[PDB]
Amino acid sequence: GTFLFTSESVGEGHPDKICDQISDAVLDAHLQQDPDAKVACETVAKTGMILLAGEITSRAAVDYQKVVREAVKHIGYDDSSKGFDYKTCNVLVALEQQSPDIAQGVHLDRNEEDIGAGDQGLMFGYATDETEECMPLTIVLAHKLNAKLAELRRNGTLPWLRPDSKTQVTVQYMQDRGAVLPIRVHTIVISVQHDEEVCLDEMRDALKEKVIKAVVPAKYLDEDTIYHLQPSGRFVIGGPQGDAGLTGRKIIVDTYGGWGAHGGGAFSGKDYTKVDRSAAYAARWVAKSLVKGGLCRRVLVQVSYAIGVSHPLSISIFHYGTSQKSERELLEIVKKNFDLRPGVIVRDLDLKKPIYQRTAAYGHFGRDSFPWEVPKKLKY
Amino acid sequence: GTFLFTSESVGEGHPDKICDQISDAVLDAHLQQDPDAKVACETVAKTGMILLAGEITSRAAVDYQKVVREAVKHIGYDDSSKGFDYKTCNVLVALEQQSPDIAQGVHLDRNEEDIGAGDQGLMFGYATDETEECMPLTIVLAHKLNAKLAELRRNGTLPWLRPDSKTQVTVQYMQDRGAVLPIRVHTIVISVQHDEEVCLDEMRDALKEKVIKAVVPAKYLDEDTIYHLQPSGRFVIGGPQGDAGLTGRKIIVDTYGGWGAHGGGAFSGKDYTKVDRSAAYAARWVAKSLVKGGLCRRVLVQVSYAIGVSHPLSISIFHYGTSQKSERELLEIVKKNFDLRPGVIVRDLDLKKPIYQRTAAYGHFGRDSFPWEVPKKLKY
Ligand SMILES: CSC[C@H]1O[C@@H](n2cnc3c(N)ncnc32)[C@H](O)[C@@H]1O
Ligand SMILES: CSC[C@H]1O[C@@H](n2cnc3c(N)ncnc32)[C@H](O)[C@@H]1O
Ligand SMILES: [K+]
Ligand SMILES: [K+]
Ligand SMILES: [Mg+2]
Ligand SMILES: [Mg+2]
Ligand code: NA
Ligand code: NA
Ligand code: NA
Ligand code: NA
Structure with missing residues (x-):
């Protein structure tokens, strides 16, 4: 009756995550001045380079040099010895206005509530009662391991740490009438960029004692748990120097860690009219x-849209057998309680507010009581 | 008992797909000369620009200008009137060697069969008996609609078509003891870039009569089917000019269309040591x-890896209730019949062969009898 499931997370300095954070720093900078900015900002990172590419139509005056460099500073890349430095890297900008053909078909001369979806696409939301925050334990633990690394880097207790990290957690679960019950942690992987001086044994001991034991309840760890700590043996080169980064290349880290499903669209760098983000947030909220x-212990919600059309084309509910109500009955409850037009979601979830950089590391869900994490009281 | 499910696909000229195809053209060009090339090539596309960024260590001598431009030519962007021209666009290259720290931890001085995984990560494979090719009908139809558009563009019967397209198919299904049975097509979306002269009514009529009816069996279409054809009303600006493209931003189009699950890692531009690709192909094969x-009618397979470690850290089988055997029994059959080390997968699936550009549009699965599509006869 038991099975394994694995999820991963990455740190703030993983090069793809750097790009997500920069894209959302750009979005927030626009929204601070123009709440109706149309933003589709992609970021690419390689040795010494941040490139912004995409489409923005906005009344804001944004200093891209400043915004990009401040985001990189916050992440912690502040010296050539670390492989990347906000003070001295290249920032290149290839940003144009939003296509007028898109604008006319989506939002021009439309009542806000009746704005069209900014694109076609499909999106999923997921929730599981296995944690209080309704997220899978595998990814919660993986995120918290990366957060702990950043904490110990920033407080100076492990000064050999650098910002680029990856973690992976395999949990053994029991099935329980469609719900899932975590039993124990089967395997943990941690890889983190480090300075040239610290030895492997010092790092592996610290990762077990000061990171894993600080994060993972002892009840989940036992003599059989497998630890892969700095498994490559050496990770001095890191950040964009070690691996190119792009926005929207961590979409499973951003969501449910392999659980549930994903429609494919990235979140970061996009304003609310891009339903890839707003409708995924709304689906999580549902x-x-x-x-x-x-109404159920575990649920997957699908929604989909066509460009220029306000109402979703489809809505689907899959409850894994964890409700007394049928999926059809739950769908009817959802349809009676939620209006998933983007121009209504924006109001319900306050999606013009410039909080997006806060979403761009450690997952968009299960944290911080964002509006999509505050349940709606359902009438049925 | 019925439900809706939606999947999308995109055409060869969708800007993200352009990038996938270029990344895999680069990979193939290297593999033609050096079957052991280490390739991690990301591509970015915006108005007038293809940028290559990433890491390649290879004995090949590759003319990136030629390889990139030939790929864009094949896609069909050959004139400024179409928004992009292989003859005149900018090709920029930011490629470095593979990090020596990665190389030493993954493959240096290792027996090929015992090469480590090139990264940590999780991957999923999926199969469903609802079509002969064991793929979801929603995405099969979505891909075929894009292929039909490209066919009618290339044969000159709809000369107003351009290469950038998106499609989306919603099917109504019945549940059948964990398997799924398609009933009818509920909604179809098609958006395709077009010339300045053709009118909306001509396009919508052609899309219904020459594209949809040519692809979708009439038995699935009825008086209630909803058609969203050129729903934005105008799509003259397209390709990278309309929307920036990046490699690895169509990972759900590349796989199962929302069905199954995804571990997050992109396929294109990566050689077999990147388990994001090779282990996902092997999981599909399983x-x-x-x-x-x-042994079952529908199945999801998870595998995961740690960088530098050959054997997977976890393997899981989920059969949706569609087998008489337990999931544990199926897992034992899988473990007895498959060796999911990357240095064995490469041999079983012939993954040094330069066929990757062929995978980079219309999905990596369900087509062309690639090695991962030829079932293994199982002993149990
Ligand atoms: C293996 S390259 C993909 C990711 O793995 C991490 N990485 C980079 N170099 C190493 C290394 N030497 N050892 C382990 N992980 C690494 C970085 O987070 C990178 O973005
Ligand atoms: C809406 S931008 C995202 C994708 O939608 C497509 N697209 C671009 N412009 C339009 C348009 N005017 N109408 C419909 N789809 C478009 C292109 O495939 C692009 O990559
Ligand atoms: K990369
Ligand atoms: K884009
Ligand atoms: Mg990446
Ligand atoms: Mg895209
Ligand atoms: Na274990
Ligand atoms: Na819609
Ligand atoms: Na219908
Ligand atoms: Na491994």
Whole structure:
């Protein structure tokens, strides 16, 4: 009756995550001045380079040099010895206006509530009662391991740490009438960029004692748990120098860690009219509302859109057998309680607010009581 | 008992797909000369620009200008009137060697069969008996609609078509003891870039009569089917000019269209040591082998790895209730019949062969009898 499931997370300095954070720093900078900015900002990172490419139509005056460099500073890349330095790297900009053909078909001369979806696409939300925050334990633990690394880097207790990290957690679960129950941690991987001086044994001991034991409850760890700590043996070169980064290349880290499903679209760098983001946030909100409302223990929600059309083309509910109500009944409850037009989601979830950089590391869900994490009280 | 499910596909000229195809053209060019090339080539596209960024260590001598421009030519962007021209666009290259720290931890001085995984990560394979090729009908139809557009563009019967397109198909299904049975097509979306002269009514009529009816069996279409054809109303600006493209931004189009699951890693531009690709191909091979072997009607396979470690850290089988055998029994069959070390997968699936550009549009699975699509006969 038991099975394994694995999820990963990455740190703030993983090169793809750098790009997500920069893209959302750009979005936030625009929204601070123009709440209706149309933003589709992709970021690419390689040795010494941040490139911004995409489409922005906005009344804001944004200093891209400053915004990019401040984001990199916050992440911690502040010296050539670390492989990347916000003070001295190249920032290149290839940004144009939003296509007028898109604008006319999506939002021009439309009532805000009746704005069209900014694109076609499909999106999923997911929730599971296995944690209070309604997220899979595998990814929660993986994120917290990366957060702990950043904490110990920033507080100076492990000064050999650098910002680029990856973690991976395999949990053994039991099945429980469609719900899942975590039993134990089967395997943990941690890889983190480090300075030239620290030895492998010092790092592996610190990762076990000061990172894993600080994060993972002892009840989940036992004599059989497998640890792969600095498994490559050496990780001095890191950040964009070690591996090119791009926005939207961590979409499973950003969401459910392999659980649930994904429609494919990236979140970062996009304003609310891009339903890839807003409708995925709304679908999470629906899923979490169903679980916290006691209607089911685990649920997957699909929605889809066509460019220029406000109402979703399809809505689907999959409850894994964890409700007394049928999926059809849950779908009817959802349709009676939620309006998933993007021009309504923006109001319900306050999606013109410049909080997006905060979403761009450690997952978009299960944290911080963002609006999509506050369940809606359902009438049925 | 019925539900809706939606999947999308994109055409060869969608800007993200352009990048996937270029990344895999670069990979193939290296593999033609050096079967052991280490390749991690990301591509970015915006108005007038293809940028290559990443890491390649190879004995090949590759003319990146030629390889990139030939790929864009094949896609069909050959004139400024179409928004992009292989003859005149900018090709910029930011390629460095593979990090020596990665190389030493993954493959240097290792027996090929015992090469480490090139990264940590998780990967999924999926198969469903609802089509002969063991793929979801929603995405099969979505891909075929894009292929039909390209066919009618290239044969001159719809000369107003351009290469950038997106499609989306919503199917109504019945549940059948964990398997799924397609009933009818509920909604179809098609958006395709077009010339300045053709009118909306001509396009919508052609898309219904010459594209949809040519692709979708009439038995699935009825008076209730909803058609969103050129729903934005105008799509003259397209390709990278309309929307920036990046490699690895169509990972759900590349795989199962929202069905199954995804571990997050992109395929294109990566040689076999990157388990994001090779282990996902192997997991598809496992899933399809289980379904074609009669052991189940629908199955999801998870595998995961740590950088530098050859054997997977976890393997999991989820059969949706579609087998008489337990998931544990299927897992034991898989473990007895498959060796999922990357240095064995490469031999079984012939992954040094330069066929990767062929995988980079219309999905990596369900087509062309690639090695991962030829089931393994299972002993149990
Ligand atoms: C293996 S390259 C993909 C990711 O793995 C990490 N990485 C880079 N170099 C190493 C290394 N030497 N050892 C382990 N992980 C690494 C970085 O987070 C990078 O973005
Ligand atoms: C809306 S931008 C995202 C994708 O949608 C497509 N697209 C671009 N412009 C339009 C348009 N005017 N109408 C419909 N789809 C478009 C292109 O495939 C692009 O990559
Ligand atoms: K990369
Ligand atoms: K884009
Ligand atoms: Mg990456
Ligand atoms: Mg895209
Ligand atoms: Na274990
Ligand atoms: Na819509
Ligand atoms: Na319909
Ligand atoms: Na491994």
